[model samples]
Target: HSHGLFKKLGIPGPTPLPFLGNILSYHKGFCMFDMECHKKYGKVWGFYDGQQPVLAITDPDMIKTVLVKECYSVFTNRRPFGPVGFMKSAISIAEDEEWKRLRSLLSPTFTSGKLKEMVPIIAQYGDVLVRNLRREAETGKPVTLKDVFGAYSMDVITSTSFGVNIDSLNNPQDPFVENDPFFLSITVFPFLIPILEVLNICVFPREVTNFLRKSVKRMKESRLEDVDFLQLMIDSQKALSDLELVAQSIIFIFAGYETTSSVLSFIMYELATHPDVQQKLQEEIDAVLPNKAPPTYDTVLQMEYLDMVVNETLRLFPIAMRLERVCKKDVEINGMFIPKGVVVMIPSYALHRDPKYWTEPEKFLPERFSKKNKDNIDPYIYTPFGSGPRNCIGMRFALMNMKLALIRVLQNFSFKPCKETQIPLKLSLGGLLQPEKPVVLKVESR
Candidate 1:
């Protein structure tokens, strides 16, 4: 805990300083902190983020019990991060019954049939991306992928979510592309939120949210989506409230835009560096798509090697460094007593890289996820999108879009690191394990 709060609970952990607690240690983000914590403090331990005492759990049985067995009964809510800015009513942050209500309606929006219908919609942009990259290949200059994927993912999000066709591939100056949304990196203690609120501060920028909110408001007043996010949220049968609709729109846009881009960037970086792996992936692409004649939902989902590549990339660069769950009641497991209100942290990133669970943990091997071997995986140890009830709702949505992009790009071109490319990616010390410099690459025409 921050001060003597660790005294309340008897668990081994790194000593916490006064007000900042162990928060200062996370100055570079929790990307590797959890792994270091594991070695220094054992698998089960306690740590403080400001005043909040978080119990970090790594044992598979305890993990299964908390995330799966009694998911709804005890770990029903995530630890409340105070003064949630634009994401107030988003299903990601809603607690108890409110979470139940929001997830109920929103989950249907991404049904298999609905997602199947979305393939051609997203594939349209895949074509745009191909042509865009073809020109970049001609230039023979290192392409800045963070900028490229940002626009591609943004274009896909806008077209799919708002039912608006925004050609961000060519138009970098578009307002949507220009909107640089960032989550606050402030050291937040939930109790101090009241004081923070008095001073008028929140987790996200007011102006950016206002811009996003305004766009959503205008869209609702207008009309139509074949089954876009706006239409699904305000579906006639089980509609979210206007406020919920707005918040959810912003949430999806932010959540949908950022993570997918980062993932695509990493996959490209890995593919570029590992030429043999990239060639194998292209062979799989050629078999399924057959001369790049547009990939169907089934074809994209069918690529076994593509699935493996995606899995391997995420294993190394998982975005959700830690999955947090709040205990609804006191629970004792494996001799560790976690009181109600304590935040339970599952270090997904740490476990994903742990040598005990994976063979040659540092090596990039996609075969580990192949059909023959996937069954051997301990589900709790390698949670990319997390496990159980609160796992990422956008899993399929993200995969569909990610696969479509990979299939198209790998079909037409190949990636290789240029001199401009950062060899050992200097990951920015922040919430997401993102590169500090642009992921520079030479796009060679295949």
Candidate 2:
């Protein structure tokens, strides 16, 4: 924590600019931060942000010191946002006491017991997904299983998250996707961020954020007769502030959708390309699942292969991969010092593909996730849900939902690679790693 020792420990950085510091470099040149940082400084790099000099700690040990040990000092304060902050603050974005209260309130909602109770819902929706895909198989048509699976995932999340009976399988471009007020603006409203910031409003877009806020408020006002997750948030008001509830609600829905949608997309992509694996998966499902009905909570729990497949999918296509932090106080790392107020970006996308961890890091091999193999790997090397107290509280919910969905889909059909699938998947660099092109697959009945 010494100023002079810290300043002398790490490599020095670019001179500070105006408002954005080194952020302007992202705009002017190639915006690949992690690659650029690694290219210039090897594993660790030092950079200046406005007046503060920050160190980019790419090494796992260095990252652990900053994120796990010094998290309180580094990550307690919330960053300034445009209008997006005005809605509900998600657990990831909330600061200090508000974050603690909200996280505690919503934590119990995602407990194993609660998630287990919802397995029947997941199983039923999985049946709907299989039935839809089976129709494609019967009619001799290619199946874009990602979209189909996303719809099924959305339905399961909606019913469990909001207690709304949304029949998404019959209607793929459903009301929520096609016409929901929050859905449209959130997708297309990034242009308004600067405008909101200019006005010092932090309202993402007043039009968009305010409208959604009002919608949620209305949902709250009229939700007395309803028994949904929102009720739990409402009941917890005695323990949480209004803003805290808003943060958790907005984040819960958004996070639930974003994480599941990405997993389904990537899973189908892998299935399309990996025929032998898909066949093995289908055979396993056939052997385990009874012919009478679709898998329920009890039956799906016994799916060991399903667990491997889902875990491997998460390894390759983590939705919330990167974890960013800013130094609140100077910290010494690896014989160098990182100054206060410097931003540190931990690129999970880069780390997941590091050759040091896995034998064939880029290859889609579910067997790598088996008990013996997984034990040999470092826990920090594959943190799809992040780590420590700051890690995702809803990891259990997300994993369980994914397991059930995969089990049902694999049981119904084996996917064949379509012409559209890009082989040796390219990780789309951003908020989440996505397939650059749509991965299409042909489905055949088992």
Best by lDDT: 1
- lDDT of all the models against the reference? 0.82, 0.65
Q: How close to the true structure is residue 96 of candidate 2, measured as C-alpha lDDT?
A: 69
Q: Which stretches of candidate 1 lie over 4 Å from their true place?
A: 1-8, 178-190, 198-200, 224-226, 236-239
Residue 376: error of model 1 in Å? Answer: 1.4
Compose the digit string of candidate 1's lDDT tens values, residues 241-303.
777787787778877788989899999998988999999999988888886778898888889
Question: Candidate 2, residues 1-446: lDDT per residue as tens digits?
Answer: 12232247645444444433554454322225655566556776665433334455667787676557667655554343335545536676666666766667777787777777877767777777777788888987766655776677677766776665676868655444321333224224445556655675653445544454665677777785553467667776737666556556656666666578778878877777877777777777777775835666666667777778888887776675566676666667656565566667676765676677777877889998888877876666677887766778888878888777777777667777766656777655433356656567777887
- Residue 440's lDDT in candidate 2: 71
lDDT for 274 (candidate 2): 78
> What is candidate 2's CA lDDT for residue 273?
80
TM-score of 2: 0.83
Q: Estimate the lDDT of model 2.
A: 0.65
